[PDB]
């Protein structure tokens, strides 16, 4: 019938619109991107949006900071959507760690760091990931950990100085109380050098990306190990009986936050 | 370098650990790290020729 | 001999501050060492004074 | 022997190349160096 046909068509247009917006986003245009994104039913398409943002950051970690700012803005209006992104990102990191997929560990962790910088996720997640990576330190595990600490370290220092202190103590034990190779010993000396210069090349949020008022953000406390449901089924088209109601419900939201 | 040029039996007795821990106040682990580091450094510095 | 005297404003006296460290921690071996074989069983350490000098 | 090996109190001496306890000081920083710390710091800090 037409109800199915229209829901499917609207679903396909929604996926494409989101995909385009995610490809377009950068620092200079983030505000317009948000405005255009909000016009779309990103509640119905919360899985679609989460998937597009996660795939984009994975393929283009050079823009991680920008994806984090985008997520931060959306989360401030729709915390449940930011929570869905975080849950999947955490699971992605764990998949990578489990599969010894260093690239995915590098990009997923980089995303985590910037969602922490943006106060979308609680820093307990960073600390737990760093502890995991540093327990049985390998060349790859240390490389992920150090790249990760560079990105969230300044933030860590501010909200949890004792936590980051514990990480650095651990790194020093590895640097001396362990039998390590040149590669590990170099990456750690780099990390101490970065801490010494006060993370001068790794600011918490770049000028132009701190767009959510402190008190308007919703900081999710999501530990590393929890049995999160990624809800990937939300990515698949399905007929919605309350499609009418659900549609009119969203536009009521949209008119609210504009 | 002048000792290994003269091929004398190179031994060493380094000094001032009271300057190391009563003045710079290191923990035991970092002090062991520093002493093993300077022993490995003078080992790699003697092992040139 | 140019004393520098790092001051203290916090407890836990081995603070390890104003001090970098270039030694790669947790992994190093570049020189041979005596006894590379944890094989010797308990024979000569008297348990009345197996302990170090102080724990009080 | 007391260099580059880790001492731990039960199972009296098994000088391993690893750490059984997650915070394990080595035999050089449990037998000679930290007793020197204890005597030195207690004689320069607690004289009365």
Swiss-Prot record, chain A:
Entry keyword Nucleus: yes
Residues annotated as domain MIF4G: 15-198
Major localisation: nucleus
Alphabetic keyword roster: mRNA processing, mRNA splicing, Nucleus, Phosphoprotein, Spliceosome
Any GO MF annotation of the entry: RNA binding
Intracellular or extracellular location(s): Nucleus; Nucleus speckle
Subunit annotation: Component of the pre-catalytic spliceosome B and the catalytic spliceosome C complexes. Component of the minor spliceosome, which splices U12-type introns. Interacts with EIF4A3 and PRPF19 in an RNA-independent manner. Direct interaction with EIF4A3 is mediated by the MIF4G domain. Full interaction with EIF4A3 occurs only when EIF4A3 is not part of the EJC and prevents EIF4A3 binding to RNA.
Family named by the database record: Belongs to the CWC22 family.
Stated role: Required for pre-mRNA splicing as component of the spliceosome. As a component of the minor spliceosome, involved in the splicing of U12-type introns in pre-mRNAs. Promotes exon-junction complex (EJC) assembly. Hinders EIF4A3 from non-specifically binding RNA and escorts it to the splicing machinery to promote EJC assembly on mature mRNAs. Through its role in EJC assembly, required for nonsense-mediated mRNA decay.
Listed name of the protein: Pre-mRNA-splicing factor CWC22 homolog
Source organism of the structure: Homo sapiens (Human)
Curated annotation (Swiss-Prot), chain B:
Superkingdom, taxonomy of origin: Eukaryota
Binding residue positions for GTP: 15-18
Cell compartments where the protein resides: Nucleus
Disease entry from the Swiss-Prot or TrEMBL record: Mandibulofacial dysostosis with microcephaly: A rare syndrome characterized by progressive microcephaly, midface and malar hypoplasia, micrognathia, microtia, dysplastic ears, preauricular skin tags, significant developmental delay, and speech delay. Many patients have major sequelae, including choanal atresia that results in respiratory difficulties, conductive hearing loss, and cleft palate.
Function as written in the Swiss-Prot or TrEMBL entry: Required for pre-mRNA splicing as component of the spliceosome, including pre-catalytic, catalytic and post-catalytic spliceosomal complexes. Component of the U5 snRNP and the U4/U6-U5 tri-snRNP complex, a building block of the spliceosome. As a component of the minor spliceosome, involved in the splicing of U12-type introns in pre-mRNAs.
Subunit structure: Component of the U5 snRNP and the U4/U6-U5 tri-snRNP complex, a building block of the spliceosome. The U4/U6-U5 tri-snRNP complex is composed of the U4, U6 and U5 snRNAs and at least PRPF3, PRPF4, PRPF6, PRPF8, PRPF31, SNRNP200, TXNL4A, SNRNP40, DDX23, CD2BP2, PPIH, SNU13, EFTUD2, SART1 and USP39. Component of the pre-catalytic, catalytic and post-catalytic spliceosome complexes. Component of the minor spliceosome, which splices U12-type introns. Within this complex, interacts with CRIPT. Interacts with ERBB4 and PRPF8. Interacts with PIH1D1.
Annotated family: Belongs to the TRAFAC class translation factor GTPase superfamily. Classic translation factor GTPase family. EF-G/EF-2 subfamily.
Protein's recorded name: 116 kDa U5 small nuclear ribonucleoprotein component
Full-protein positions shown: 244 to 292 of 972
From Swiss-Prot, chain C:
Tissue expression per record: Widely expressed.
Its job: Plays a role in pre-mRNA splicing as core component of precatalytic, catalytic and postcatalytic spliceosomal complexes, both of the predominant U2-type spliceosome and the minor U12-type spliceosome. Functions as a scaffold that mediates the ordered assembly of spliceosomal proteins and snRNAs. Required for the assembly of the U4/U6-U5 tri-snRNP complex, a building block of the spliceosome. Functions as a scaffold that positions spliceosomal U2, U5 and U6 snRNAs at splice sites on pre-mRNA substrates, so that splicing can occur. Interacts with both the 5' and the 3' splice site.
Organism: Homo sapiens
Assembly: Part of the U5 snRNP complex. Component of the U4/U6-U5 tri-snRNP complex composed of the U4, U6 and U5 snRNAs and at least PRPF3, PRPF4, PRPF6, PRPF8, PRPF31, SNRNP200, TXNL4A, SNRNP40, DDX23, CD2BP2, PPIH, SNU13, EFTUD2, SART1 and USP39. Component of the U5.U4atac/U6atac snRNP complexes in U12-dependent spliceosomes. Within the minor spliceosome, which acts on U12-type introns, interacts with PPIL2 and RBM48. Core component of U2-type precatalytic, catalytic and postcatalytic spliceosomal complexes. Found in a mRNA splicing-dependent exon junction complex (EJC) with SRRM1.
Span within the parent record: 335 to 390 of 2335
Record's subcellular location: Nucleus; Nucleus speckle
This protein's domain notes: The MPN (JAB/Mov34) domain mediates interaction with TSSC4 and SNRNP200. Has structural similarity with deubiquitinating enzymes, but lacks the residues that would bind the catalytic metal ion. Contains a region with structural similarity to reverse transcriptase, presenting the classical thumb, fingers and palm architecture, but lacks enzyme activity, since the essential metal-binding residues are not conserved.
Highest taxon above the source species: Eukaryota
């Amino acid at each position: 019938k037409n109800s199915l046909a229209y829901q499917r068509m609207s679903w396909e247009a929604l996926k494409k619109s989101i995909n385009g917006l995610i490809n377009k986003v950068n620092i200079s245009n983030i505000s317009i991107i948000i405005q255009e994104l909000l016009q779309e039913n990103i509640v119905r398409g919360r899985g679609l949006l989460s998937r597009s943002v996660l795939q984009a950051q994975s393929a283009s970690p050079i823009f991680t900071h920008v994806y984090a700012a985008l997520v931060a803005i959306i989360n401030s209006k729709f915390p449940q959507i930011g929570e869905l992104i975080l849950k999947r990102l955490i699971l992605n990191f764990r998949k990578g760690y489990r599969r010894n997929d260093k690239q995915l560990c590098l990009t997923a962790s980089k995303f985590v760091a910037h969602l922490i910088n943006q106060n979308v996720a609680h820093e307990v997640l960073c600390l737990e990931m760093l502890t995991l990576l540093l327990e049985r330190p390998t060349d790859d595990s240390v490389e992920v950990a150090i790249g990760f600490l560079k990105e969230c370290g300044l933030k860590l220092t501010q909200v949890s100085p004792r936590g980051i202190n514990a990480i650095f103590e651990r790194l020093r034990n590895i640097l001396h109380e362990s039998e390590i190779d040149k590669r590990v010993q170099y990456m750690i000396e780099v990390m101490f050098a970065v801490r010494k210069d006060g993370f001068k090349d790794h600011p918490i949020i770049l000028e132009g990306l701190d767009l959510v008022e402190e008190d308007d953000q919703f900081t999710h406390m999501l530990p590393l190990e929890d049995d999160y449901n990624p809800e990937d089924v939300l990515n698949v088209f399905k007929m919605d009986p309350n499609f009418m109601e659900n549609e009119e419900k969203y536009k009521a939201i949209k008119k609210e936050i504009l | 370098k002048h000792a290994v040029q003269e091929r004398l039996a190179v031994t060493v007795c380094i000094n001032k650990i009271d300057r190391l821990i009563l003045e710079l106040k290191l923990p035991p682990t970092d002090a062991y790290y520093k002493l093993r580091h300077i022993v490995d450094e003078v080992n790699g510095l003697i092992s040139m020729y | 001999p140019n004393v520098v005297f790092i001051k203290t404003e916090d407890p836990d006296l081995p603070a390890f501050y104003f001090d970098p460290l270039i030694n790669p921690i947790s992994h190093r071996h570049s020189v041979k060492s005596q006894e590379p074989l944890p094989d010797d069983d308990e024979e000569f350490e008297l348990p009345e004074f197996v302990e170090p000098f102080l724990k009080d | 022997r007391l260099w580059g090996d880790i001492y731990f109190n039960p199972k009296t001496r098994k000088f391993t190349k690893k750490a059984p306890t997650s915070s394990s000081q080595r035999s050089f920083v449990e037998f000679i160096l930290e007793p020197l710390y204890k005597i030195l710091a207690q004689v320069v800090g607690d004289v009365d």
